[PDB]
Amino acid sequence: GEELFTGVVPILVELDGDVNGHKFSVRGEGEGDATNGKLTMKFICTTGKLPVPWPTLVTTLVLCFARYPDHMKQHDFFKSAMPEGYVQERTISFEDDGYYKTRAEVKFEGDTLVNRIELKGIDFKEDGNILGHKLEYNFNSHDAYITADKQKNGIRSNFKIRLNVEDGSVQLADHYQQNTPIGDGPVLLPDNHYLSTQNKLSKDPNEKRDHMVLLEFVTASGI
DSSP states (O other): OOGGGSSOEEEEEEEEEEETTEEEEEEEEEEEEGGGTEEEEEEEETTSSOSSOGGGGTTTOOGGGOBOOGGGOOOOHHHHTTTTOEEEEEEEEETTSOEEEEEEEEEEETTEEEEEEEEEEESOOTTSTTTTTOBOSOOOOEEEEEEEEGGGTEEEEEEEEEEEBTTSOEEEEEEEEEEEESSSOOOOOOOSEEEEEEEEEEOOTTOOSSEEEEEEEEEEEOO
16 A cells, blocks of 8 residues: 555656557556546557557556555555556567567656556558557456566566457457566565456547547456
8 A cells, every 4th residue: 555546646658669660659648546446548649640559558558556445455566666666568469460568667757657668569460450450449348367476576467358359359469467666665565366457448529639538447356
């Protein structure tokens, strides 16, 4: 638990990406309410058209806002690392297609929780579901198993995401994640547990740019 999260906290997300040579940038702003595990964001592609589908970026674009209920009485690694924060890295593999590599730093800059990301995408098919924009504009609910990484004083998670394809099939995006603390402050390593996430994606009717409006709920649970 952390006193930095008892109220509503402004959020800034900055992503620089390069997928098969197609460079782009995303900036998001919003706020987070860890007491209810809730966040609300609006993201904008500041370089023009986004060359990948927005649902492929949801997981990359702040787990410190999860709600850890009292009855679990579990250590919250993500908040205990704050204000200095942590590095979050992922490989994301798309079935029968290319993959993302991401490195992000999540930390306070002033009163704002910042998620600053570098993303690189490799070996995508120019008319697969990703570069061909064949994915539905939505996002399913999922659970992710969190385990302690004692040797790196951090955590790991491997989890799958089912992405809805416009032909009615699903395409799996398998995620492989590591988080390590920034600085040398003491952090709480948790026992194994789950984070449960639900998302709602929408559009702003007065927004001309390529954008995504996002509502997300994150709750710890399990075992």
